[PDB]
Every structure is written in structure tokens, then in C-alpha cells.
Amino acid sequence: GMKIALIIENSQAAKNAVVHEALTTVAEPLGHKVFNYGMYTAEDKASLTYVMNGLLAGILLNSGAADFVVTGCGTGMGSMLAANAMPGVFCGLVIDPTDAFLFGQINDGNAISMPYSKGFGWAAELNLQDVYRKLFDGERGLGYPRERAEIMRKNRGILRELKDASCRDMLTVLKTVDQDLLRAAIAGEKFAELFYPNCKDDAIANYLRSLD
Amino acid sequence: GMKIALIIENSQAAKNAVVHEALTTVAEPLGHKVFNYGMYTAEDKASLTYVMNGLLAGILLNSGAADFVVTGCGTGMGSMLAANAMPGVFCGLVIDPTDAFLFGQINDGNAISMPYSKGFGWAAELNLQDVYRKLFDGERGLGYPRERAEIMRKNRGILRELKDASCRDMLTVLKTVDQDLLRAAIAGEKFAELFYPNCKDDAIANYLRSL
Amino acid sequence: GMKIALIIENSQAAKNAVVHEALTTVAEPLGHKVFNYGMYTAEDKASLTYVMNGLLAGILLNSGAADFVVTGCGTGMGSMLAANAMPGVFCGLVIDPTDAFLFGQINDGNAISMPYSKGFGWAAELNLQDVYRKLFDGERGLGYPRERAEIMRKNRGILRELKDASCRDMLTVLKTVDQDLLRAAIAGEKFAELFYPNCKDDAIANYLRSLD
Amino acid sequence: GMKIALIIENSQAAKNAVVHEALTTVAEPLGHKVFNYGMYTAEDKASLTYVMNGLLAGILLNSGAADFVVTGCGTGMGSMLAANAMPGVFCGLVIDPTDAFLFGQINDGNAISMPYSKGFGWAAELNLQDVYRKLFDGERGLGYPRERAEIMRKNRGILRELKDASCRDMLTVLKTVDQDLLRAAIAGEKFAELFYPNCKDDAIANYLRSL
Numbered sequence: 001g002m003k004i005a006l007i008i009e010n011s012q013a014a015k016n017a018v019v020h021e022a023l024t025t026v027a028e029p030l031g032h033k034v035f036n037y038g039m040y041t042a043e044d045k046a047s048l049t050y051v052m053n054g055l056l057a058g059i060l061l062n063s064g065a066a067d068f069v070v071t072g073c074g075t076g077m078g079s080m081l082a083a084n085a086m087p088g089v090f091c092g093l094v095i096d097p098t099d100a101f102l103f104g105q106i107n108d109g110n111a112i113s114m115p116y117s118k119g120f121g122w123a124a125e126l127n128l129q130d131v132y133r134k135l136f137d138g139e140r141g142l143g144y145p146r147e148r149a150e151i152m153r154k155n156r157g158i159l160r161e162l163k164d165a166s167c168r169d170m171l172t173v174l175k176t177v178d179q180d181l182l183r184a185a186i187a188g189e190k191f192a193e194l195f196y197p198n199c200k201d202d203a204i205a206n207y208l209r210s211l212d
Numbered sequence: 213g214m215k216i217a218l219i220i221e222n223s224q225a226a227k228n229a230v231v232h233e234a235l236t237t238v239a240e241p242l243g244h245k246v247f248n249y250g251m252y253t254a255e256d257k258a259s260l261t262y263v264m265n266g267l268l269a270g271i272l273l274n275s276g277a278a279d280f281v282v283t284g285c286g287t288g289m290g291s292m293l294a295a296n297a298m299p300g301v302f303c304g305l306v307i308d309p310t311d312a313f314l315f316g317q318i319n320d321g322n323a324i325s326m327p328y329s330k331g332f333g334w335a336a337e338l339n340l341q342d343v344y345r346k347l348f349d350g351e352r353g354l355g356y357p358r359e360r361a362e363i364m365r366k367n368r369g370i371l372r373e374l375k376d377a378s379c380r381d382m383l384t385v386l387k388t389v390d391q392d393l394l395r396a397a398i399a400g401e402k403f404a405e406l407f408y409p410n411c412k413d414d415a416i417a418n419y420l421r422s423l
Numbered sequence: 424g425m426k427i428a429l430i431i432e433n434s435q436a437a438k439n440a441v442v443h444e445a446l447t448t449v450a451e452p453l454g455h456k457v458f459n460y461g462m463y464t465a466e467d468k469a470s471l472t473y474v475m476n477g478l479l480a481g482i483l484l485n486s487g488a489a490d491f492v493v494t495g496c497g498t499g500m501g502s503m504l505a506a507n508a509m510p511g512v513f514c515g516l517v518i519d520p521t522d523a524f525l526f527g528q529i530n531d532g533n534a535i536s537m538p539y540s541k542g543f544g545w546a547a548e549l550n551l552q553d554v555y556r557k558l559f560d561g562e563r564g565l566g567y568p569r570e571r572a573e574i575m576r577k578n579r580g581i582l583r584e585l586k587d588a589s590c591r592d593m594l595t596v597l598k599t600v601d602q603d604l605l606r607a608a609i610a611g612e613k614f615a616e617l618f619y620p621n622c623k624d625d626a627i628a629n630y631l632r633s634l635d
Numbered sequence: 636g637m638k639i640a641l642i643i644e645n646s647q648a649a650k651n652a653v654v655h656e657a658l659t660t661v662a663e664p665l666g667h668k669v670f671n672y673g674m675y676t677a678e679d680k681a682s683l684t685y686v687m688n689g690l691l692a693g694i695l696l697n698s699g700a701a702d703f704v705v706t707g708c709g710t711g712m713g714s715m716l717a718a719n720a721m722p723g724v725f726c727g728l729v730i731d732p733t734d735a736f737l738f739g740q741i742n743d744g745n746a747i748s749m750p751y752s753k754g755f756g757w758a759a760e761l762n763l764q765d766v767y768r769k770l771f772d773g774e775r776g777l778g779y780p781r782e783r784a785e786i787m788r789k790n791r792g793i794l795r796e797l798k799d800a801s802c803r804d805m806l807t808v809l810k811t812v813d814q815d816l817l818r819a820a821i822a823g824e825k826f827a828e829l830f831y832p833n834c835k836d837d838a839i840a841n842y843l844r845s846l
Contacts, residue, residue: 510801
């Protein structure tokens with residue numbers, strides 16, 4: 001069972017319900033728990049940009065409040081970039097079910113960003129489900145092909161070490177980032193309710209509270 | 213014009229020639245210069261993994277030896293992840309020409325990673341040309357939809373600040389990363405010839421020289 | 424130059440303006456003439472279904488009133504199936520520019536059907552232009568892969584003979600098709616204006632005229 | 636279930652085994668029967684062109700020897716065009732699993748043609764299965780969006796009538812097509828074996844034997 005967090009920015013806010021619905025439909029019966037961090041509607045007082053999506057993703061993943069993050073934007077590129085700017089975050093840009101499958105088996109990342117405008121029309125919510133089914137059902141990182149799973153597992157490790165060298169720890173990032181950006185990123189009405197009970201890292205929880 | 217660098221890892225080395233040709237076919241007539249960092253063939257003594265492609269991309273972009281990097285792997289995911297792990301690197305995963313277009317206009321990043329196995333069959337080399345045409349011709353960062361242009365321009369800025377806060381400077385990364393991984397990343401037969409005459413950061417050049 | 428006809432059915436009528444603009448932007452500078460047969464708006468009294476799209480394509484191509492037809496629907500599948508049920512119509516289902524390029528070089532058909540809902544989001548209208556550029560600029564049927572160029576040229580010919588064996592001439596079709604379907608197909612407010620002056624086949628012009 | 640026929644032309648004959656495997660893997664457990672009419676390899680004596688794929692599809696479908704036909708070519712366009720030239724054949728060009736789903740639900744055709752070269756790279760066989768699961772599991776033509784359901788069902792009928800008007804009966808077609816084309820279409824080593832015991836139209840069976 002995974003704690004899966006959903007984060008949606010203002011350009012695509014009106015699509016949050018649909019996406020949340022696809023996600024709960026697939027992940028809940030699989031024994032996971034879905035947390036909708038919003039935006040819930042385009043009229044939310046607490047508005048998010050794709051940059052905040054990435055920052056929030058970093059908070060959730062590093063704190064243990066989420067095991068996996070689902071996000072995106074019009075094309076999904078913005079949110080991908082922002083998320084990958086964060087320590088400990090490995091965010092794929094996933095389009096189809098094969099992409100999802102391979103992402104899960106080869107890269108075994110902890111976030112995905114998808115397009116919710118570009119290529120998103122009739123039945124796009126059905127592709128979302130197909131993708132969720134590839135990601136959240138089954139063991140991840142077994143590699144494809146399972147034989148070649150060795151080189152891949154190794155490389156993933158080397159990547160983590162490389163990123164450990166480039167990126168500062170999340171707490172440091174929280175202390176040094178634009179503080180209005182940070183406040184905005186966590187300003188959602190349900191944030192406190194969803195986060196604090198699930199946050200395993202006291203220092204992060206303490207810092208964020210300290211903003212009050 | 214732009215200095216555009218090509219970097220291919222071992223799983224797709226056999227495709228470096230096809231990718232390079234597509235790339236020079238479009239970029240040269242546009243007045244750009246293409247630097248092929250290899251791998252050139254599956255048999256190259258200096259082999260690259262997708263992690264090294266990312267590391268090498270950070271060296272090239274932060275030193276100024278390249279203005280733009282073209283990379284990838286079977287899916288392009290691995291190189292995307294590694295590249296984006298690096299300071300000052302904003303690497304897109306591009307599939308089709310509309311992806312390319314939007315990347316250029318919304319994100320105005322400095323690298324792209326593409327799949328060279330998945331989806332790669334007939335006329336895939338032509339799609340590559342269509343994508344390069346979108347990327348290397350015209351003004352970037354003008355935004356799409358246009359009504360979202362200012363917001364977008366500002367957000368790119370805010371994103372650069374965010375990453376500046378999260379990532380250490382490239383020179384620091386070089387001194388602190390696995391040193392054998394670094395040596396491997398720059399081991400290419402032609403690395404020196406392509407790199408040093410174009411590097412604008414002496415501290416980086418001199419450090420790599422010291423290895 | 425070519426005479427290029429645009430046909431849009433009811434589910435996507437709202438998009439006729441966008442498709443029509445992508446089309447003229449590319450085709451006119453290339454020295455082609457574009458004929459918009461509607462639907463122009465979702466508000467048109469003369470409504471078309473995808474079955475009519477195919478029938479009209481047949482009328483236009485066999486009559487010589489058009490040299491190429493651009494149509495579609497939600498997915499483009501309906502209009503494709505309807506277009507291809509007609510004599511002398513070879514309609515491709517095209518998604519991306521490589522598809523378009525390959526269609527022109529291998530099949531050299533006289534119609535295309537494209538999705539106007541599935542996959543149709545941001546910049547979808549730019550992909551349209553990209554596709555048009557591959558279809559309406561340069562020589563057709565030169566083949567890809569180039570080594571199969573003759574084989575491909577022969578096959579197109581054999582295909583034509585096959586369809587000649589299966590399909591009745593357009594005139595016969597017109598005389599035996601559901602007359603209500605046919606009447607609705609040509610009920611468009613601009614049909615006459617666009618058609619008769621370009622129709623090369625008097626027999627077809629005659630037959631339709633008599634239906635008033 | 637259904638009797639599902641697989642037809643592969645020469646440009647992609649080397650891929651027949653992989654396709655047959657994706658299809659059996661999915662379709663059989665679902666209670667269907669898969670009939671592989673070849674080509675089996677690039678070296679079959681009896682070679683198929685995309686034009687024959689279409690001709691053969693009409694034979695199988697109209698004779699009731701198959702309920703559904705799976706075919707294709709490099710792009711799938713040729714087999715699609717040829718298949719659709721035939722009476723009683725409604726062949727979609729399917730790329731992805733959503734395409735497949737919508738086809739089954741909106742158009743409820745009896746054949747599909749897919750690309751076995753364009754876009755067919757690494758891991759392409761996984762998508763094949765994804766597509767087949769959409770096609771061969773569940774009821775068809777229930778519409779999507781179901782808010783256009785009845786409309787959709789009405790239109791398919793209208794389309795079948797239109798095509799009845801345009802295309803000649805299959806036996807008339809068999810008597811009037813180039814007879815060498817026809818012979819080559821059914822020259823496959825297992826044709827008789829697969830077709831005859833399943834043909835529900837004696838007049839077609841008789842005519843083909845009359846050859």
C-alpha cells in the first residue's frame with residue numbers, strides 16, 4: 001500500500017476532479033491511499049503554479065507524507081522540471097501505458113507528471129486509468145527485461161548518488177527557497193489535514209509549522 | 213548561432229550516426245554548430261551510461277561549451293532524470309514536433325532527451341528532423357497559449373531560482389561526485405578537442421585537466 | 424494547384440473554423456484552393472453526420488469538384504470508414520506529420536480523416552498545419568523506404584483495380600443510396616456555390632440538381 | 636468467443652511470430668480462437684502484399700470463416716485501404732489502447748490494421764497486447780461518450796446501408812477481381828486447412844475450390 005499524492009496547478013485546476021476520479025478508481029481497489037492536495041477548482045483561494053507543484057512534491061516525498069506523487073500541467077513539462085529540481089525526487093514524464101510500465105520497471109521513480117491539455121480530449125481519462133494500472137499494480141524496478149534488471153538496478157543507484165551530490169537536503173532547501181513561494185505551495189485548505197499526520201520527518205513538519 | 217552537443221549512451225550507440233546526421237542536416241543550415249560527443253559506435257572504448265550522459269550534459273551546459281544538449285536512451289527517461297539532476301540544466305523529454313514546439317515556447321530549456329528505441333522505426337529519423345526544426349529555428353520563450361506568455365516567462369524565472377536554491381554549483385558537483393564516474397563521462401576519444409576550445413569557465417576546464 | 428475540400432460533421436462543427444484556418448494558412452500559399460463545405464458552426468440547420476461526410480467526399484472526388492478531401496470526427500474513424508466505402512476514394516487516417524508524409528509517399532490517397540476530439544488539445548491546431556505541410560507540398564508517391572518505391576507504385580495500381588472490381592460507380596451509388604441521406608449530405612447552404620462550378624461530371628451535376 | 640484471423644504481408648513477415656504471440660496470449664484465455672493465415676516468415680513461397688491482405692480479409696469475414704481480422708503493414712495504411720475496399724468489411728487503423736476501445740465501442744468494426752514498423756520499436760509488443768485486451772474483452776458498440784450512444788448505433792446502420800449500395804457482394808467481387816491476385820491471396824500453405832472447415836458460405840467455398 002502506498003500513499004499517493006495528487007497535485008494540480010492553476011492552468012489545469014478544472015481537471016482536478018476528473019483526474020482524482022481516475023486515480024481513486026484504480027488505486028483504491030489496489031489497496032493504496034490517495035491524497036488530493038488540490039487545486040480542487042480554478043476558484044481556489046490557494047492557487048498553485050507548476051513550480052509550486054515541484055516544491056510540494058519535494059516536501060511530500062522527502063517527509064514521507066507521500067510515497068508517490070502524481071502531477072502535471074498542460075504538457076506536464078513544467079511540473080516535471082520543478083519536481084526533478086528537488087532532492088530525492090525522480091519524476092517521469094509519462095504519456096502512454098508502455099511509458100508507465102517501463103518507467104516503473106526501469107527507472108522506478110517516485111513521481112510522474114502527465115499532460116492534461118496537450119493530447120487531452122475524448123477519453124483521455126481512460127488512458128489515465130490504463131497508466132495508473134501499469135504503475136500501481138505489481139512490483140516495481142524488477143527491470144525490463146528482468147534479465148537486464150541488473151545493470152538497471154545498479155545505474156539507478158549511481159543516479160541517486162550523483163543526485164545526492166548535486167542537491168541539498170530538503171530541509172536546507174525549505175530554509176533557502178523564496179518563502180512566499182513556500183507559503184503558497186502549502187496554502188491549500190486541506191494541506192495541514194493531509195500532511196502533518198503523515199509526515200515522518202519532524203524537522204520538516206516543525207519548519208513548515210514555524211511559518212505560522 | 214548555437215553550439216549543440218550530442219551525447220548517446222551505450223544502449224543506443226549504434227544509432228549515433230543516424231541521430232547525428234538528422235541533427236546536422238537541420239542545424240547547420242540554420243547556422244548552428246553541432247558537437248558530437250559520442251558514443252559513436254557500440255564498440256567505443258569509452259563507453260557511456262545514461263547517468264554519465266546527464267553528468268556530461270551538466271559539464272557542457274554550465275561551462276558554456278554547449279548552448280544546448282541533445283541526448284536520450286531507449287526511452288529517454290534515464291538521461292532526462294540524470295540531466296535534470298544537474299545544476300543549470302532543464303531537460304525536456306520530447307516526442308513529437310508539437311512537444312518540441314511547446315517545450316521551446318513554454319519552458320525554453322537547454323536540453324532534450326528523446327527515445328531512440330521505443331517508437332523508433334520507419335521514418336523515425338524524419339521525426340527527429342521535424343523536432344529539430346521546431347527547436348532550432350525561431351525565437352524561444354514566447355509562450356503558448358499566448359495569453360499565458362507573461363505568467364510563463366515569470367514562472368521560468370522562479371523555477372531557475374528554485375533550482376539555484378536546491379542544486380549546488382557545477383564546480384562543486386565535479387569535485388564531490390564519484391571521480392571514476394566523472395573520468396568515464398569525459399573519456400571520449402574527442403572530448404578534449406570538442407570541449408576545451410569552447411569552454412568559457414576556466415575553473416571547470418582546469419579542474420577536469422587536473423584529473 | 425489542387426482543389427481541397429473540407430468537411431466537418433456535427434460532433435465537431437464547433438471546430439470547423441479552427442481546422443479551416445489551419446488549412447488555408449498552409450494550402451493557399453502553396454497555390455491550392457480550399458473549399459469549406461461546412462459544417463460551419465454547431466448552429467447549422469443543415470447538419471452532417473460522419474456517414475454523410477463520406478458520401479459527400481465521394482461526390483466531390485468522383486465529380487472532380489475536389490482533388491483532395493480533408494475530413495474527420497471525434498476520432499476520425501467514422502469518416503474514414505464512410506469515405507472508404509466510396510468508389511475512387513482512398514482516405515487515410517492521419518495523426519502526426521510522419522504519418523502524413525508516409526501516406527503521401529506510400530499510398531498517395533485523395534483524402535484524409537483526422538481526430539478533432541481524441542488527442543485534440545493545446546497546439547492541436549499547429550499539428551494540423553504540420554500535417555498539411557507534408558501532404559500538400561512536394562511530389563507524392565516517390566515511396567518510403569525508397570528501395571520499395573516500385574513495389575509501392577505497383578501496389579497502388581493493383582489496389583485501384585481491386586476497388587474498381589468491388590465498388591459501383593458514383594452515379595449508380597447516388598441513384599441507389601438512401602435519398603434522404605444524400606439530400607442532407609448536399610443540403611449545405613454553400614454546396615451549390617462551391618460544387619457546380621467545379622464539377623466536371625455533368626451526369627452527377629444533373630442527378631443532384633434534380634433532387635432539389 | 637470469436638474466430639480471429641491474423642494476416643501479415645511481406646514487408647513485415649519477419650514479425651508475424653511476435654504478433655501471433657501477443658494475440659494468442661491475450662485472446663485465447665478470453666475464449667477466442669486465433670487463426671494465423673501468415674505470412675509466417677519472410678521466406679514463405681506464398682507471399683502476400685497489403686492488397687491481398689484486404690482481399691483475404693473480405694473472404695474470411697464475408698464467408699464467416701472469421702469473425703474478426705487482425706492485419707497491418709509498415710504503417711497499416713495499405714492493409715486498411717484494401718480491407719475497406721471490400722464489402723462487409725469495416726477495418727480500423729488502431730494505434731493505442733484508447734483507439735482500440737473507442738473503435739470497439741463507437742464503430743464496432745470487424746477488422747483492425749496496425750503499424751508493425753512505424754512506431755514499432757522496442758516494447759511495441761506490449762502495446763499490441765494492451766490493444767487486444769481492449770478489443771476482445773467485453774461487449775461492443777455500447778458507445779462513447781455513452782451520451783451519443785443511440786446516435787452511434789443508428790449511424791453504424793446507416794453506414795452499413797450506404798456501403799451496401801456502394802459495394803458489390805463478395806462472390807461477385809471474387810469473380811471479377813484479377814484472378815492471379817486472388818489465387819496468390821489464398822496460396823498460403825494452411826489456407827485450406829483453416830478456411831474450409833470454417834467457411835459458412837458454400838458458394839464462396841465452391842468458387843475458391845473451382846480455382
